Design a protein around this ligand. Structure first.
Ligand SMILES: *[C@@H]1O[C@H](CO)[C@@H](O[C@@H]2O[C@H](CO)[C@@H](O[C@@H]3O[C@H](CO[C@H]4O[C@H](CO)[C@@H](O)[C@H](O)[C@@H]4O)[C@@H](O)[C@H](O[C@H]4O[C@H](CO)[C@@H](O)[C@H](O)[C@@H]4O)[C@@H]3O)[C@H](O)[C@H]2NC(C)=O)[C@H](O)[C@H]1NC(C)=O
Ligand SMILES: *[C@@H]1O[C@H](CO)[C@@H](O[C@@H]2O[C@H](CO)[C@@H](O[C@@H]3O[C@H](CO[C@H]4O[C@H](CO)[C@@H](O)[C@H](O)[C@@H]4O)[C@@H](O)[C@H](O[C@H]4O[C@H](CO)[C@@H](O)[C@H](O)[C@@H]4O)[C@@H]3O)[C@H](O)[C@H]2NC(C)=O)[C@H](O)[C@H]1NC(C)=O
Ligand SMILES: *[C@@H]1O[C@H](CO)[C@@H](O[C@@H]2O[C@H](CO)[C@@H](O)[C@H](O)[C@H]2NC(C)=O)[C@H](O)[C@H]1NC(C)=O
Ligand SMILES: *[C@@H]1O[C@H](CO)[C@@H](O[C@@H]2O[C@H](CO)[C@@H](O)[C@H](O)[C@H]2NC(C)=O)[C@H](O)[C@H]1NC(C)=O
Ligand SMILES: *[C@@H]1O[C@H](CO)[C@@H](O[C@@H]2O[C@H](CO)[C@@H](O)[C@H](O)[C@H]2NC(C)=O)[C@H](O)[C@H]1NC(C)=O
Ligand SMILES: *[C@@H]1O[C@H](CO)[C@@H](O)[C@H](O)[C@H]1NC(C)=O
Ligand SMILES: *[C@@H]1O[C@H](CO)[C@@H](O)[C@H](O)[C@H]1NC(C)=O
Ligand SMILES: *[C@@H]1O[C@H](CO)[C@@H](O)[C@H](O)[C@H]1NC(C)=O
Ligand SMILES: *[C@@H]1O[C@H](CO)[C@@H](O)[C@H](O)[C@H]1NC(C)=O
Ligand SMILES: *[C@@H]1O[C@H](CO)[C@@H](O)[C@H](O)[C@H]1NC(C)=O
Ligand SMILES: *[C@@H]1O[C@H](CO)[C@@H](O)[C@H](O)[C@H]1NC(C)=O
Ligand SMILES: *[C@@H]1O[C@H](CO)[C@@H](O)[C@H](O)[C@H]1NC(C)=O
Ligand SMILES: *[C@@H]1O[C@H](CO)[C@@H](O)[C@H](O)[C@H]1NC(C)=O
Ligand SMILES: *[C@@H]1O[C@H](CO)[C@@H](O)[C@H](O)[C@H]1NC(C)=O
Ligand SMILES: *[C@@H]1O[C@H](CO)[C@@H](O)[C@H](O)[C@H]1NC(C)=O
Ligand SMILES: *[C@@H]1O[C@H](CO)[C@@H](O)[C@H](O)[C@H]1NC(C)=O
Ligand SMILES: *[C@@H]1O[C@H](CO)[C@@H](O)[C@H](O)[C@H]1NC(C)=O
Lengths: 433, 124, 124, 433, 124, 433
């Protein structure tokens, strides 16, 4: 009968805001710079009851606040160490005698810019480009981009970061198990900040991600599209094992006054390939279970096929392992198989690059220093990245990444940030007497 | 610490009826880096969201009263449902659709109807 | 939004008499970049100017009362004009010249005369 | 009879504070970086009644908060693109054969610092200095200042910015028509933020400014002075038309690894002068109307005269047009005329410079890339910049700019920022019973 | 200016008895650079320390009362000394040792016992 | 009987927070950049009564917030001026003919990078290192660290800065006279910000510090230790006088386009040593009074001895004077004397360095430009820095600095920052009726 107000009513509104880091509590690190708030030892999640809120996955904002600050993080970390500007000259490379690795010998300047020692290093064939053959090479992209090297003390090992909304905001979180990526889900719980998100970098097969619950989820945006990718979440973790058995020996060389970097010296013993491993019976059943969950959304037979080709960042399985950047073939005994109706091991050949152009842009090109001794990393494949062919009979799926934001859109497929509006207005009997 | 935890705590029973959110709250209340700039940008916004609703409360003669009861007549061009129809057959999120286009004309009306209380009875 | 709009709205009739600013207010109230650092430096100052006057109000027993009426006797060494001479033949900007040198001795006097109200009558 | 307080009383005090941007809502731009708050679609100005507030024009603070952040804006924008440090060597220039433009040929380094191609470019005679003639030139100021180039994607087109005071402050604005620059005006209105201010850069004649109301205003500080300039606001907009009819062809050259810039290639067709145009009957009456409004403040005859001379940033009309920086003669048929008691066209000769030292300082010197094809910009001359001779019979006015803050002191001649003090104290009858 | 000066002014007679700090206060109250970032980091913390204690006051039905008197019974498992033993034979710094482990269970109890006052008597 | 609350009770807690500057109100300066709040003309200190608070000196936090921001201050100030990267080449130095100062002659590049003038300068023998003698030197550390020079306009004269806690915090301050460095002192007073702290830089003998009150204080951490230093505060100020009587002539040389620096030209007149002076009778009694205050804490005889040796930043008395960095011998007639039971003058030989590696780190190495004419600075020695030998009869004290934080731990030996908690809870008779 009269207007009254109410402080603290459950009313929210979708908005866009600025989140922050929270690590789980001492060498420097590019992801968590040891400047993050400590997390809650027991996070308080408030389960809501009998409410259906619809939210989009692809129209999120946290996946754009995650691709920006990671770029700023590598920009902040690769600043105070040495750029390899005076490195690339007319190199004189033949081969190693231990075609994959070339023995380059060039003229670097010593600590004072009046003498020139000829110094030798070892580079990969995927890292130098010729000029004429006649064996005169140069570094791969010191014509479009200035090239810096990684400061050798820092690491790249992804420790999980939590994204906390500011005080006065809320982060919804869907708790439904079989949640298709866009729509209303009816088991919603608020949380101040999300679970541990490892900022993993891969482009073909997702690594170290959280598994699904009790089903195989096929997340997409338009399933009648050709350029829109298909994220295939998983609930059966398939273990991958990637290693290189060569014992590399790093070597310090000085190029400028106070400016040095590290390059590969000689290789110990017989040279062997860097390869990855996938158990065959843990992979054939995984492709079959994905194939049945894809047949019902197209009502025709599906057949996997090879990647497209071209540059070696699209037709490969690029990932990071222990401080080294791999580029594996991933299209030999995985993606030439159809589906009708022994403890073997699939070995993938894999090649290593030193100079990498991450996030496929120009103006930024980091250089990875070599790592002494062998490395071996065992991981979990929870997630794929498929793409329709463009036909329209049967179906053909090129395994190929669309972007790197889709690599974050698997750990952020169930979160939306909202702003509470705790002022309510209702009519009642009382008046201010 | 208790600057946004209460804001998250307001969201208990966000799907219940409007006549139960004043009742079923006591049943649940029983028990320079990059991030150095992100945290500063977050803390200024966390302060500003609290001060905006504090000034909006402070203009209406109640600055800490939860169920603040004001002397403004209910204009029935904003809503036409009775008290028993609204308070027992609606959730609090659904009310913001019906009231969602008469917000500012209620806010300024509440401000001037509180200003009249200071002018009239106290001294002048 | 309503954090400095009311500060600009206070300046209505800044040349009128002091006995009309309490009357003629209701007649008008009827209806990382470079700029990323300038806006942060502006927002901190906008919060601080509101909190300074809020603490200055909160020390005098009224934290949201507009015409707050306090129990301090008027020392006539600050001004010698009567009520009818001040309130009907002066503007509000002209009053700050006469009162402009006894500000802090009135502020501390108001603070201790409000502290006596808490000590005396309530519990002790 | 008892002390009472009042919240919200109209009491202000002059102060100094920090303002911010507001644009009118996508290539990058140096002025509004697309990081500004959106303006009010209808700004709320509160007209005051029966109050006289005196404020100074020359003692303002916004004109010092405008010369600082614009310097910081160009500092922020010219950072991440290439500096022309390894460019200037012993150049070997003769002439173009299409004296004004020289055909320079120099030794730049290629993408790897071991080979040297001889590359040719075309420069202006106002941009290189000789060394002996014998035709060996160098760039104009790579001995005092490191020289950078403009990042070629950004633009310089001045979109208007609004300056908003923080919440809890006020910006007064005089509404008097015939307001002499310093004194009390009796029609004052508060506004949260000012109108659209185009951050135009000129030094001789003001461009694209807001006209006066119904009179010609002669703003100064001391009219019995010789070094203090005289801003002459206008109410009759005189149109200027400045163009160059040559079809320039830009050309990319590479000087370092990942470091390239653009220089003038060959010129299409016959070479023609860059000139400006001013209608004669729209200018003779404008000088006569200014002359009568200057005679009464000196009570002697006035006679305009030429500029002083020396460097070509003082005796010229320097301005920006479409991404090119002009330097026109402006002293041919404008400033050799006295005042007693046909649709022609005055053509001013005008020369173009590439390397400019804006804001007449050392340590900063930007380089403008050439613009392909012709350009043509039509503008409004609302404002002059005169200076007394220093005699003391008659009067002589050298048209010459004193600074660049005076270029902002025409759009900010009627604004002063104040801080409200909403606490009032008055005696009344009531006491706290 | 008066945003932390009162915080420093609270520390008068920090070694006196608890029954004298309410008495002997009136006897003493009678009369972009590097530093550009340090001052901003200081001012945000100065605002946040005031707003935290302001919300902690505002949840207990008193938002400017100094000696705020609340209707919560004294659980004697927190302390066992009487009123005359505590208030005349202890300093205020020594009290925070005995009460120092029952702080949050008193804070939440005060919040819900203030929430009951709004639910019960006013409207519902 | 019922719970009541109290706003504003005297309850504090030790914490860690962020302090700020306050100077005593125009060339640029590295310490106070003319961006600091003005101090109180009369600071308000609130003396506490009948309270004992124990605080540690070595476990402070302000001495770690003082070593960090000073590093950031020199990082901010040495940024926008020229680095001496292209300076160090194969130098060709013989001697000066006016062994201590060498006449170096090298090939610098002129304003355009195509010609090379041979330019001569004068360097110190403590500043170049040979390469073979055969007289081919180079600069001292352009092999580990990039070397920049000081911007020549700024000064190093330490004006005192005050450290103010944020609003809502308190800084305790002990007022006891004979305060041993760690323990409870019973005369405590709060202050918003501390007294004037000159940010002096020395490593052997403390300079321009505040004297003790009425006693000699021997501050340490573990007096039965060997690596923990011993700060010996003083109450008798001993005057030092350090000067160089040579009339140096600076000279500008240009190394790059827009890049110049200053070096020593020729020396006027006969060369003389730079020396320091200490009155003998004002020093013998000072060592005797320190020796008696050290005998009672070990109960054996003590004997001072020479420094250890090695590099010339540990076995010296390094300090700054008027813009020049000295390195004096300090171990001739000071530290070879025991203690049993004429107005002379002790002269210390002292050598000057140009390139200095302050704060004994790598990656930072500033270069000091020379100062035209003689300099003379008179100062006060209030404080020593001793170190036990490591034996265990008698005792031997090597005078040698442990760090540079110990240089701040004499002016911050009596301050601790706390956070007030003004909420109190007490039982009383009243209830909310
Ligand atoms: C996806 O998830 C997998 C999970 O297995 C990750 O694999 C881990 O990768 C990290 C990074 O390479 C490995 O951590 C490194 O292990 C090295 C060997 O560990 C030995 O020592 C530890 C000590 O507790 C034993 O527990 C362990 O069993 C081994 O015996 C260490 O040497 C490394 O530490 C230090 O190494 C050198 C010094 O020699 C330093 O320079 C380094 O900076 C570092 O401080 C390091 O801890 C980890 O072992 C792997 N887990 C395994 C093999 O189970 C993937 O990295 C992850 N992410 C992807 C694929 O992107
Ligand atoms: C003082 O005020 C005058 C007002 O006239 C300003 O003059 C304007 O200057 C701008 C900047 O040079 C001109 O804008 C440019 O116009 C070019 C030609 O415009 C054609 O296309 C538009 C499309 O709507 C038509 O409306 C118009 O009539 C023409 O047919 C455009 O080509 C430019 O756009 C783009 O050009 C190239 C691509 O070719 C890009 O590289 C550019 O970045 C840009 O995005 C541009 O819009 C404008 O035309 C002028 N007004 C006129 C002639 O009336 C002065 O600039 C101003 N300031 C001073 C003097 O300092
Ligand atoms: C909605 O989601 C919540 C959160 O996952 C579920 O609550 C959990 O249910 C499991 C199994 O019943 C319990 O072991 C947990 O203790 C529950 N709580 C939490 C916080 O995890 C809830 O069951 C879901 N409800 C529906 C209808 O799906
Ligand atoms: C004072 O200035 C104001 C603002 O310019 C004038 O108000 C405007 O007057 C014109 C013409 O009378 C009207 O068309 C506008 O509607 C008025 N309001 C605004 C907001 O522009 C006012 O006339 C001036 N008064 C005096 C005495 O000069
Ligand atoms: C505790 O320290 C304070 C501060 O030094 C002392 O107070 C000063 O004492 C001297 C000498 O008695 C006076 O001249 C000053 O006026 C006093 N006040 C101040 C603010 O300096 C006090 O005496 C000391 N008390 C004890 C017991 O040592
Ligand atoms: C590579 O070249 C260097 C000299 O350039 C030579 O000493 C070395 O033996 C070569 N081979 C290997 C495997 O390093
Ligand atoms: C291989 O690398 C490991 C890694 O530390 C090293 O210890 C070992 O000496 C290397 N060589 C051989 C022959 O194992
Ligand atoms: C469950 O939903 C019903 C109606 O949809 C509602 O009345 C009830 O309050 C909800 N449960 C809770 C615990 O809020
Ligand atoms: C505006 O008011 C109408 C009622 O006529 C309502 O239906 C609508 O949702 C409101 N909001 C809009 C148009 O955003
Ligand atoms: C106009 O001025 C008179 C006296 O100068 C004043 O009394 C009156 O209030 C003013 N008008 C308004 C609208 O305030
Ligand atoms: C101080 O008080 C006097 C009254 O004696 C007054 O005239 C003056 O304006 C005041 N303010 C000053 C001097 O700033
Ligand atoms: C300028 O010089 C280049 C070679 O330096 C020559 O090819 C060209 O013809 C010349 N003339 C013009 C107009 O470019
Ligand atoms: C002149 O410049 C214009 C600008 O785009 C271009 O289109 C044209 O081809 C050029 N040449 C001629 C002959 O017009
Ligand atoms: C001095 O100490 C006694 C007990 O230690 C205390 O009662 C008294 O209040 C103290 N003095 C003051 C001024 O607080
Ligand atoms: C916790 O409570 C106990 C009382 O049993 C008290 O003695 C102790 O000081 C408290 N605080 C701690 C353990 O930090
Ligand atoms: C030093 O060397 C220069 C040439 O390198 C010479 O002119 C000069 O006389 C020498 N001596 C002194 C004292 O400068
Ligand atoms: C010595 O240095 C002073 C310092 O300015 C200078 O004035 C003087 O000319 C120099 N030479 C002599 C011979 O004093």
């Amino acid at each position: 009968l009269w207007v009254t107000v109410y402080y603290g009513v459950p009313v929210w509104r979708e908005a866009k805001t600025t989140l922050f880091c929270a690590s789980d509590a001492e060498v420097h690190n590019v992801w968590a710079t040891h400047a993050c708030v400590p997390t809650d030892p027991n996070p308080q999640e408030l389960v809501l009851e009998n409410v259906t809120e619809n939210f989009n996955m692809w129209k999120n904002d946290m996946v754009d606040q995650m691709h920006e600050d990671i770029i700023s993080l590598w920009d902040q970390s690769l600043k105070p160490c040495v750029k390899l500007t005076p490195l690339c000259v007319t190199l004189n490379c033949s081969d190693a005698k231990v075609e994959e690795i070339k023995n380059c010998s060039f003229n670097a300047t010593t600590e004072l810019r009046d003498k020139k020692r000829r110094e030798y290093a070892l580079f990969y064939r995927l890292d130098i480009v010729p000029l004429s053959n006649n064996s005169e090479y140069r570094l791969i992209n010191c014509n479009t981009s200035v090239i810096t090297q990684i400061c050798p003390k820092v690491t790249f090992d992804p420790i999980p970061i939590h994204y906390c909304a500011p005080a006065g905001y809320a982060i919804l979180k869907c708790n439904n198990k079989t949640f298709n990526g866009t729509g209303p889900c009816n088991n919603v719980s608020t949380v101040q900040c999300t679970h541990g998100i490892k900022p993993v970098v891969s482009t073909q097969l997702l690594l170290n991600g959280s598994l699904a619950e009790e089903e195989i989820i096929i997340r997409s945006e338009n399933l009648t599209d050709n350029v829109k990718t298909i994220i295939v979440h998983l609930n059966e973790s398939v273990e991958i094992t990637c290693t290189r058995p060569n014992n590399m020996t790093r070597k310090s060389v000085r190029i400028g006054p106070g400016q040095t970097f590290y390059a590969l010296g000689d290789i110990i013993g017989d040279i062997r390939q860097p390869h990855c491993n996938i158990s065959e019976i843990k992979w054939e059943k995984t492709l079959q279970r994905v194939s049945e969950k894809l047949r019902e959304h197209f009502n025709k037979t599906i057949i996997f096929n090879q990647s497209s080709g071209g540059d070696l960042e699209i037709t490969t399985h690029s990932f990071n392992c222990g401080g080294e950047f791999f580029y594996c073939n991933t299209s030999d005994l995985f993606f030439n198989k159809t589906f009708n109706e022994t403890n073997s091991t699939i070995t993938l050949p894999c090649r290593i690059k030193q100079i990498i152009n991450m996030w496929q842009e120009v103006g930024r090109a980091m250089y990875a220093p070599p790592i002494a001794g062998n490395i071996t990393c065992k991981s979990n494949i929870t997630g794929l990245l498929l793409t329709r062919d463009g036909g329209g009979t049967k179906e053909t799926f090129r395994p190929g990444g669309g972007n790197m934001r889709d690599n974050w859109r698997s750990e952020l497929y169930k979160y939306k940030v909202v702003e509470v509006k705790p002022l309510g207005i209702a009519p009642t009997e009382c008046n201010r007497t | 610490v208790g600057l946004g935890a209460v804001f998250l705590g307001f969201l208990g029973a966000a799907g219940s009826t409007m006549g139960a959110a004043s009742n079923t709250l006591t049943v649940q209340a029983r028990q320079l880096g990059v991030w150095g700039f992100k945290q500063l940008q977050a803390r200024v916004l966390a302060i500003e969201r609290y001060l905006e609703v504090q000034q909006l409360l402070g203009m209406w003669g109640c600055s800490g009263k939860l169920i603040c009861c004001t002397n403004v007549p209910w204009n029935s061009s904003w809503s036409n449902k009775t008290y028993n129809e609204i308070w027992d057959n609606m959730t609090w999120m659904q009310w913001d659709r019906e009231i969602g286009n008469y917000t500012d004309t209620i806010y300024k009306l509440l401000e001037v109807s509180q200003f009249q209380q200071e002018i009239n009875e106290k001294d002048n």
